[PDB]
Structures are given as C-alpha cells and as structure tokens.
Amino acid sequence: YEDFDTRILEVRNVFNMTAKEGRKKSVRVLVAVGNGNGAAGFAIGKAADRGDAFRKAKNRAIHYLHYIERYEGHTIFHDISLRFKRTQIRMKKQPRGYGLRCHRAIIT
Amino acid sequence: EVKKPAFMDEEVQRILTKITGLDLQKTFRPAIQPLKPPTYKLMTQAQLEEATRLAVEAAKVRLKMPPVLEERKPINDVLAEDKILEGTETNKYVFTDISYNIPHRERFIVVREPSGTLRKASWEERDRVIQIYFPKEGRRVLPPVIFKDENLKTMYSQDRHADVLNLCVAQFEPDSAEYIKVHHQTYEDIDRHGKYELLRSTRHFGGMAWYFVNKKKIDGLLIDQIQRDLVDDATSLVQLYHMLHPDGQSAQEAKEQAAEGVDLIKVFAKTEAQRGAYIELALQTYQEIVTSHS
Structure with a gap:
C-alpha cells in the first residue's frame, strides 16, 4: 500500500479505573488514510503503547476505504450540508485555484 | 463612377464573416481571469439547442469586426496669435473641454504656447488628455512599451497575434498611425509564416483579408484555405478580390468565361x-483527394 498515506487526526490518553492498577492508561488514536486519488478511509486504534495504537489504526483504516467522487478531480460535485450527531458541516463547491479553506482536519 | x-x-x-468562420469553442474560450463557481441547468434537447442558438447570437456580436479607417490628417489650425504674451510663460498650457455630452472627436482641446499662439491640440495630444479625463478601461495615458518592434516580435514568436491586435484596439484609435502600423505589421507576419x-473565428480576420485584397496578396490565404478544405471560403475571397479590383485582368476574365465556384x-x-502555380497545385491536390476518396 505504498500509494496510500496515513495521517493522524487525534491522539488521546484515556483512562480506565482498575482495582489492580487504579488508573490505567490507553492511547486512543484516530487516523485517516488515502491515496490522493479518490480513495480514503479512517479507523480508531487503541493500545497501551502509542506505537501499537498507530499500527492498529493504520492497518484497520485500510479496511474501510470509501471512494469519494470528485468533480473534474479537484472539487466536490455540489454543495453538501449535513449534521452528524451534534457536529454541523457546510461544504461548498469552488472553482479551480480556490484552494482548501477548511478545518485543519478537513484539509488533512 | 462605380x-x-x-x-x-x-x-x-x-x-x-463567411471566410472568418465561427467556432463556439474558440470564440468562448475560457478567460484566464478571477473565477466563480459554475451554475448548472437541466435541459431537454429542445432547450439545449435553443441555448446553443443564443450562444451563436452572442458569438456574432462578439466577432463584430473593428473599424478599418484611413489615417487621420494632422490638426494644424491656429486660433489666435497673441504676441503680447510672448516670453511671459515657459510651459505650454493645454485646455480641455470636459463637458460630458460632447463626442470626443467634437471636443475643443487647445494649446496656448509660450510664444502666445493659441492652436488646436494635435491628435496625439487629444488622445492623451481624453484618457486623463474620460478614462477608458484597457487604455493607458502614455503609449505602452509592448508595441515596440522588438516587443511585438516576441509576441509573434509566441503566436499571440490576436492579443497584439486586441491590445492595439484598446490603446489606439482606428484612424491613428500607430493603429495602422501595428495592424499592418501583425497582418504581414501572419502571411510570411x-x-x-490564428485569427479565424476572431473579429480580426476580416481586416486581415481586407488588407491582403487591397494590397493584392491573397495568394497565401487561398493556398491555406484550400489546404484546410475550405474551398467555399477561397472562392468567396476571389469574389471579394474581383469586387475591389473590377478593372483587373482577373475580374474581366471571369466575366468572359462566366466562371463560378472552383473556376473562379x-x-x-x-x-x-503572384504565385499562381501553387494555387493550382493545391487546388488540384484538393480535387484529387476529394475525387479519389469520394
């Protein structure tokens, strides 16, 4: 999968209380993958070590590859407005040379 | 007199218009300018054909040819010679009537010289001052430097003749010497090469063919029109050449033989x-290809 690149979107140190260890820490990593040519996916990997959480998310996300339709290979086909749970997103189709003007995560 | x-x-x-041609893709080629997001409409085959018709109407207004005029005559009229004011001023005064509702070619622009002579402004002075007070988008107060022969040759090397002419129309007046100089230089480079x-489906093709006809050098355009299978255009060019030169031997020969179509x-x-041998060769080869294939 050399044509795919992986990007990190969040690294969190969550905690689970245990009788043996009291506070135990895990690394929850959200990553995204894509080949820059329409195919991309994301996954969450959790582990006690950060390096392991990176591998888990990185190889898990390759199993959830969406294909995203691009108008002429540079933009979305039309405006897109949606609410996912309590997050609202309002995307707009733009002409060439406009560039990405989006949330840093959306740029990634 | 006819x-x-x-x-x-x-x-x-x-x-x-006919020899120039039309091509909606060339006439409406995308402009390299600030862009906006496109709009989209669902249309039937009837509506789509209607939209193409309006596009061809706009391409007609877009291809309207710019005027071809004779070189203006220098303005040399002295309104007054008040010698009492000789030696009292070091620099010329230029007075411009800026009344809004006067055509620019009917405005009074006078110059009071240091000698005291009150004279009418020259053509170069008239155009400069009218830019300062009635500015035209595209035109600059002082003559640009792109029109210099070395700079013009660079544009020709890049095959940017339609721009050299579009710039010559925004800057210079149709009857000015600079306008005629730049146009005749652009048309001359097209011929030799x-x-x-480059100027087909453009508003500048008519003036170019006009220039060749008047200067009796349509030979190249006929050879090139024939090699592109535009032989209806070549015949129409020979009609225009037989119209502006009625007493020419060629026009009298076509009347004698009542020639039409390829005969003309x-x-x-x-x-x-000037190069008849090649016109026949290209015309013959075209006939051979048409006859042999079809």
Whole structure:
C-alpha cells in the first residue's frame, strides 16, 4: 500500500479505573488514510503503547476505504450540508485555484 | 463612377464573416481571469439547442469586426496669435473641454504656447488628455512599451497575434498611425509564416483579408484555405478580390468565361496570382483527394 498515506487526526490518553492498577492508561488514536486519488478511509486504534495504537489504526483504516467522487478531480460535485450527531458541516463547491479553506482536519 | 466597395458594405461584411468562420469553442474560450463557481441547468434537447442558438447570437456580436479607417490628417489650425504674451510663460498650457455630452472627436482641446499662439491640440495630444479625463478601461495615458518592434516580435514568436491586435484596439484609435502600423505589421507576419488560422473565428480576420485584397496578396490565404478544405471560403475571397479590383485582368476574365465556384480560383491563378502555380497545385491536390476518396 505504498500509494496510500496515513495521517493522524487525534491522539488521546484515556483512562480506565482498575482495582489492580487504579488508573490505567490507553492511547486512543484516530487516523485517516488515502491515496490522493479518490480513495480514503479512517479507523480508531487503541493500545497501551502509542506505537501499537498507530499500527492498529493504520492497518484497520485500510479496511474501510470509501471512494469519494470528485468533480473534474479537484472539487466536490455540489454543495453538501449535513449534521452528524451534534457536529454541523457546510461544504461548498469552488472553482479551480480556490484552494482548501477548511478545518485543519478537513484539509488533512 | 462605380463606388469602391467599403469595409462596412453589407456585401463585404457578408463575405468577410463567411471566410472568418465561427467556432463556439474558440470564440468562448475560457478567460484566464478571477473565477466563480459554475451554475448548472437541466435541459431537454429542445432547450439545449435553443441555448446553443443564443450562444451563436452572442458569438456574432462578439466577432463584430473593428473599424478599418484611413489615417487621420494632422490638426494644424491656429486660433489666435497673441504676441503680447510672448516670453511671459515657459510651459505650454493645454485646455480641455470636459463637458460630458460632447463626442470626443467634437471636443475643443487647445494649446496656448509660450510664444502666445493659441492652436488646436494635435491628435496625439487629444488622445492623451481624453484618457486623463474620460478614462477608458484597457487604455493607458502614455503609449505602452509592448508595441515596440522588438516587443511585438516576441509576441509573434509566441503566436499571440490576436492579443497584439486586441491590445492595439484598446490603446489606439482606428484612424491613428500607430493603429495602422501595428495592424499592418501583425497582418504581414501572419502571411510570411502562414499563420492564418490564428485569427479565424476572431473579429480580426476580416481586416486581415481586407488588407491582403487591397494590397493584392491573397495568394497565401487561398493556398491555406484550400489546404484546410475550405474551398467555399477561397472562392468567396476571389469574389471579394474581383469586387475591389473590377478593372483587373482577373475580374474581366471571369466575366468572359462566366466562371463560378472552383473556376473562379483557377482564373485567378492564370491572370493575377503572384504565385499562381501553387494555387493550382493545391487546388488540384484538393480535387484529387476529394475525387479519389469520394
């Protein structure tokens, strides 16, 4: 999968209380993958070590590859407005040379 | 006397429009300018054909040819000679009437010289001051430097003749010497290098063919029109050449033989063509290809 690149979107140190260890820490990593040519996916990997959480998310996300339709290979086909749970997103189709003007995560 | 055909004669505009041609893809080629997100409409085949019709109407107004005029005559009129004011001023005064509702060619622009002579402003002075007070988008107060022969040759190397002419129309007046100089230089470079296709489906093709006809050098355009299978255009060019030169041997030969269609082009080769041998060869080869294939 050399044509795919992986990007990190969040690294969190969550905690689970245990009788043996009291506070135990895990690394929850959200990553995204894509080949820059329409195919991309994301996954969450959790582990006690950060390096392991990176591998888990990185190889898990390759199993959830969406294909995203691009108008002429540079933009979305039309405006897109949606609410996912309590997050609202309002995307707009733009002409060439406009560039990405989006949330840093959306740029990634 | 049979009137000499004009550029705006309804007959000349018909022939010049035909040979120029139309191409909605070339006429409406995308402009490299600030862009906006496109709009989209769902249309039937009837609606789509209607939209193409309006596009062709706009391409007609877009291809309207710019005027072809004779060089203006220098303005040399002295309104007054008040010698009492000789030696009292070091620099000329330029007075411009800026009344809004006067045509620019009917405005009074006078110059009071240091000697005291009150004279009418020259053509170069008139155009400069009218830019300062009635500025035109595209035009600059002082002559640009792109029109210098070295700079113009660079634009020709890049095959940017339609721009050299679009710039010559925004800056200079149709009857000015600079306008005629730049146009005649652009048209001359197209001929030598056979770059007639650059100005097809453009408003500048008519003036170019006009210039060749008046200067009796349509030979190259006929050879190039024939090699592109535009032999209806080549015949119409020979009609325009037989219209602006009625007493020419070629026009009298076509009357004698009542030639039409491909005959008109053959008559031109024998009678008045500078390079008749090639016109027949290209015309013959075209006939061979058409006959052999179809």
